[PDB]
Chain A
Amino acid sequence: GPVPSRARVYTDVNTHRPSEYWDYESHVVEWGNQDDYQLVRKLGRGKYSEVFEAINITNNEKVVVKILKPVKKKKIKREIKILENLRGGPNIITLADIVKDPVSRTPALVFEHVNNTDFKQLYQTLTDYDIRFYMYEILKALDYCHSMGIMHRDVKPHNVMIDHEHRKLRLIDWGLAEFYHPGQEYNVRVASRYFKGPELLVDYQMYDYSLDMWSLGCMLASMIFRKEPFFHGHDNYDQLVRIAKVLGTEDLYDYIDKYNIELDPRFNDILGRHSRKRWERFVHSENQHLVSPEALDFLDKLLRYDHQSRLTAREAMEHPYFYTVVK
């Protein structure tokens, strides 16, 4: 079978924490009073949730209410435990309350008010400095959650809320997040198609925090090259083909061999054989002002097939691409 793998960093964090920390199925939810909150306007609708601008009538504070549909309601304890464990961490969305309809039994998460603007709305208009600045803010959140034994597993522009005027960023939607336990085989049906790192696409289950780093690299590539999404696959199989047309197939087969991954035979007629393309091939007159040797060196060190070979969030924070960021 497949060769085991362990995270290079924060490997045994959860072993050194009590079961109360990571045993979300045993968590006793602290329910607030639903009548403290009133809906103002609908902000959107996820695959398993509904989001609203709302108000806390006990103190007139603006809040965001996320109503969880049955499939998300079933894993609510995991999302709640992760949000409470990470609460107060850098650029982590703050969970303010948890309520439930006494009639329908529908649960809802109440969060700290965040301006209703996602990264995707602006990330295609930013200056070179702003891309570095916001990337660094996302890295602070990822290094924190990874250091706390948690993988986000759904890093993408829509899950990054930015108040551009106040240069403030929050990592949201922890509904797919999980606790990392070394040697654990996880469900590969995580992350959105364009931000799925290769381990998911080849059904390699023993992945870790480095999955979030591949997704972050996909966001960077889209930002610096003005190409949304950067790897534009039509399904999970074609997504791996789009990646192989850039990273090349030689390194893919070396990766599959290293971890003894069984490559689905459907890939036989579609992957083909491709050279590794130089990152400079994506540079053109409309994006050249966002590209630098440091941006390309950094991107090259995130977008690697081998999950252990990718920069960690803290190593990424130390890259020269971020030297101009005011820390």
Chain B
Amino acid sequence: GGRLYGFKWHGGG
């Protein structure tokens, strides 16, 4: 339920 233009996100690291 958290997408931008259908992409999920890969943060942190």
Contacts and interface: CB of A to CB of B under 8 A. Distances in A.
A108 B8 contact: no
Contact of A101 (B5, B9, B10, B11): B5
A102 interface: yes
Nearest to A50: B5
Contacts of A103: 6
A5 interface: no
Interface in A100-114: 100-104, 106, 108
A161 interface: no
The residue in B3, B5, B8 that gathers the most chain A C-beta atoms within 10 A of its C-beta is B5
B10 A57 contact: yes
Contacts of B6: 34, 100-104, 106
A134 interface: no
Interface residues of B, number: 9
Contacts, number: 36
Interface stretch (A36-44, A138-146, A309-317): A36-44
Contacts of A65: 7
A35 interface: yes
Contacts of B9: 38-40
Contacts of B4: 39
A63 to B, nearest CB: 11
B5 A38 contact: no
A40 B12 CA distance: 9
B12 to A, nearest CB: 10
Interface in A185-219: none
Interface in A26-85: 34-35, 37-40, 50, 54-55, 57, 65, 67
Contacts of A100: 6
Contacts of A34: 6-7
A65 B5 CA distance: 11
Contacts of B7: 34, 37-39, 54, 65, 101, 108
6 contacts: A38-B7, A39-B8, A39-B9, A54-B7, A101-B5, A102-B6
Given A38-B9, A39-B7, A39-B10, 12 more contacts: A37-B7, A38-B7, A38-B8, A38-B10, A40-B11, A54-B10, A55-B10, A101-B5, A101-B6, A101-B7, A104-B5, A106-B6
CB-based closest 10 A-B pairs:
A101-B6, A38-B10, A106-B5, A55-B10, A39-B7, A38-B8, A67-B5, A39-B9, A101-B5, A34-B6
